[PDB]
Amino acid sequence: KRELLRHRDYKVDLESKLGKTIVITKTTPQSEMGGYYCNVCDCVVKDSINFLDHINGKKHQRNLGMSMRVERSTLDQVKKRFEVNKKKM
RNA sequence: GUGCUCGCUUCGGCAGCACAUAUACUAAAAUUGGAACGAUACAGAGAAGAUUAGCAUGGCCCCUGCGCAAGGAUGACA
């Protein structure tokens, strides 16, 4: 039982820690280590684009109970999305 | 199905007759798994002897001292 893949509604904080230096000792955990950390995956990745590859990967989405299948939206959903933005602006 | 029986029988039909004789990895679809030497991260002298300083031992030749063994020549009246 795997749910369908859902588009992330939150922006990714790839740029958040530019210039912010991290002093790394032996006792420091992977959470505060340099780079990007998948709290769901418990893995460290040291690129923004490689972290994006991770959070777009089969294993990361599997750990979230997802799959590599995207919902097939219908006519009314797209039309109502159009009307929703028309109302919002 | 086509055509034919001097058949029943009517052109509405029926019974029999000649030919037709055994296709398919068969598949459209089902699903969950395991996965780089590709990137970034680290290191990166990515080919050398893996050394040189003394003293003592060992070999050869003298010199000196002590010991052992066997010896050579010489010296001393009252």
Largest sheet: 2 strands, antiparallel
Shape summary: elongated
Specify the helix fraction band.
25-40%
- Give the CA-CA distance, first to last residue: 39 Å
Please tell me how large the radius of gyration is.
Answer: 18 Å
Find the count of extended strands (DSSP E, 2+ residues).
Answer: 2
Number of helices: 3
Label the structural class: mainly alpha
Strand composition percent: 5-15%
Strand order of the largest sheet: 1-2
* Run of helices and strands: EEHHH
Secondary structure elements and pairings:
Layout: E1 36-38, E2 43-45, H1 48-55, H2 58-63, H3 75-88
The structure holds one RNA strand of 78 nucleotides.
PDB class: splicing
Keywords: spliceosome, pre-catalytic spliceosome, spliceosomal B complex, splicing
Entry title: cryo-EM structure of the human spliceosomal B complex protomer (tri-snRNP core region)
Give a summary of the structure in a few sentences.
It comes from Homo sapiens. The protein has helices at residues 48-55, 58-63, 75-88; strands spanning 36-38, 43-45. The protein is mainly α.
What does this structure look like?
This is Zinc finger matrin-type protein 2. The chain has 89 residues and is mainly alpha-helical. It is 31% helix and 7% strand. The chain has a two-stranded antiparallel ribbon with strand order 1-2. The longest helix has 14 residues, at 75-88. It starts with 35 loop residues before the first strand and ends with a helix. The structure holds one RNA strand of 78 nucleotides.
